[PDB]
């Protein structure tokens, strides 16, 4: 069975320094060309570089000087030599095999993490989102969320436990400033909040937080 | 350079749907060994971009018959001649036939469904930011459909354009509607500076923006 298994991926200061491997199985790296390509935060997918099965390197203007692809063939194992990073280069990096001039990227890796930031490990920040005078006049009621300033990713939210479930969202991180920022939103009945004990539980591992915020009704 | 482009950015279908997802390249992309290399990818969520096709028409082992691939010269298409749950995701293309190498932005397969009006929820800065110094007002458009939407904030009367972050919920797995979130974020003086806060929304639900908001010092 073929594998390609990467490793290596981690978070890098600019400017900094990253080796990452990939081990390969199933085949020989001389009867086939292998490559890496990424995949950005926004999900884009670029190419980063290229060894033929005879030992040709490619690579694409952004990346040639900076990266440096070279294989093991004894040991099966393709590597990417990483430096002069910048933030950009915060992606998912998967080494594939393909078939030299019939496929480019016919077996992908499941790939590694290379986050590039200046950033240090920042518990985050959670306040309770309680609902305006007005919102509350009705049938439902939702509340929320806000998780401020954390670093790294990610961070795990939760309400009431894992009790509230059906009828959340939570969204997306987003950098503010070299620092995540993420909000959930859960909905439910009018008669099953306040009266009903609501709570957002999130946990930033990194930095070994673990805290509860109860959603209380504002108002003096 | 070639570049591939992919549209629509978000293809919304119904299952069963015949559909055809247009890449297209800003010059020709014939290698110099007369084959084009241009290759269509599917990545699932959660997983990583599989082959589907090869050099324009070839479609790789394993993959369904549903899928077909085609084109010349610029224009390349990939078909699917019945959707199914499991074909939902990104599709993208891509050209190996000059260097470098590129990939097409990708186009999402999603769902269709009945439009959906979002509602809006506010919310002012919790009293535990404010001591920290600080003032976010965050804002939610849930369940809406479809995805497009403007959401728009304004301080006293005054569209505040500045400093706000949005992130966006992947279509609902559910009921497959999308949901938003908005955070304008100020400081606690500046925040003690205004009393009017609000949040417009803007979906093909209203042109006249669904909002809500609150005062400061009351409600
Ligand atoms: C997969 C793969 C190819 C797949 C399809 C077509 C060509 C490929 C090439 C060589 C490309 C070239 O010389 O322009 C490769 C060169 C090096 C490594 C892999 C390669």
């Known amino acids: 069975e073929v594998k390609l298994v990467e490793s290596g991926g981690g978070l890098v200061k600019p400017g900094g320094s990253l080796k990452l491997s990939c081990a390969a199985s199933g085949f020989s790296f001389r009867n086939y060309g292998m490559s890496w390509v990424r995949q950005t935060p926004e999900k884009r997918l670029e190419w980063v570089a290229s060894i033929s099965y005879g030992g040709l390197i490619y690579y694409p203007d952004s990346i040639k000087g900076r990266f440096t692809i070279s294989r093991d063939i004894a040991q099966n194992i393709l590597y990417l030599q990483m430096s002069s990073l910048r933030s950009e280069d915060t992606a998912m990096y998967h080494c594939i095999r393909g078939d030299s001039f019939l496929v480019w990227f016919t077996f992908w890796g499941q790939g590694t993490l290379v986050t590039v930031s200046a950033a240090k490990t920042t518990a985050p920040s959670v306040y309770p989102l309680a609902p305006v005078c007005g919102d509350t006049t009705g049938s439902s009621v939702t509340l929320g969320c806000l998780v401020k300033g954390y670093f790294p990713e990610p961070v795990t939210l939760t309400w009431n436990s894992g009790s509230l479930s059906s009828g959340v969202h939570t969204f997306p991180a987003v950098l503010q400033s070299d620092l995540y920022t993420l909000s959930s939103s859960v909905t439910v009945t009018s008669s099953t909040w306040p009266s009903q004990s609501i709570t957002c539980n999130v946990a930033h591992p990194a930095s070994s937080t673990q805290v509860d915020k109860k959603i209380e009704p504002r108002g003096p | 350079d070639v570049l591939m482009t992919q549209t629509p950015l978000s293809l919304p279908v119904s299952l069963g749907d015949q559909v055809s997802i247009f890449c297209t390249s800003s010059?020709?992309?014939?290698?110099?060994?007369?084959?084009?290399?241009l290759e269509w990818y599917l990545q699932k969520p959660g997983q990583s971009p599989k082959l589907l096709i090869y050099?324009?028409?070839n479609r790789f082992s394993g993959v369904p018959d549903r899928f077909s691939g085609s084109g010349s010269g610029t224009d390349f298409t990939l078909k699917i001649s019945r959707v199914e749950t499991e074909d939902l995701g990104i599709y993208y293309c891509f050209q190996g036939s000059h260097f470098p190498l590129a990939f097409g932005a990708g186009t999402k397969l999603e769902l269709k469904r009945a439009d959906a009006a979002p509602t809006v929820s506010i919310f002012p800065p919790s009293s535990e930011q404010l001591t920290s110094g600080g003032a976010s007002v965050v804002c939610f458009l849930n369940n809406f459909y479809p995805k497009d939407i403007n959401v728009k904030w304004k301080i006293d009367g005054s569209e505040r354009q500045n400093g706000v972050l949005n992130s966006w919920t992947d279509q609902d797995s559910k009921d497959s509607t999308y949901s938003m979130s908005s955070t304008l974020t100020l400081t606690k003086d500046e925040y003690e500076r205004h009393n009017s806060y609000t949040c417009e929304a803007t979906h093909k639900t209203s042109t006249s923006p669904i909002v809500k908001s609150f005062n400061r010092n009351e409600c």
């Open positions: 050099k324009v028409s």
């Open positions: 010059q020709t992309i014939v290698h110099t060994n007369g084959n084009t290399y």
